[PDB]
């Protein structure tokens, strides 16, 4: 979807507590599973995926990092 939509969707799951605009491993999992079951681009887990992504979002995934994930998925 467009950045606007990806942002909206991201925020839907990121807007909990602690940080309202970063998906934790939990919220990343929840987002992926709920919104993108068709695109579970992980493995026999998503730990590795998480570690691969989080070279930035301090144990979570910022919007940029997520949009980059979507970019990767799309590619």
Binding residues for Ca(2+): 22, 27, 54, 56, 58, 60, 65
3-state SS of the chain? Answer: CCHHHHHHHHHHHHCCCCCCCEEEHHHHHHHHHHHCHHHCCCECECHHHHHHHCCCCCCEEEHHHHHHHHHHHHC
Annotated binding-site positions: 22, 27, 54, 56, 58, 60, 65
């Amino acid at each position: 979807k467009s950045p606007e939509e990806l942002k909206g969707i991201f925020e839907k799951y990121a807007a909990k507590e602690g940080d309202p605009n970063q998906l934790s491993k939990e919220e990343l999992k929840l987002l992926l599973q709920t919104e993108f079951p068709s695109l579970l681009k992980g493995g026999s887990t998503l730990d590795e995926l998480f570690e691969e992504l989080d070279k930035n979002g301090d144990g979570e995934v910022s919007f940029e990092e997520f949009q980059v994930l979507v970019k990767k998925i799309s590619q």
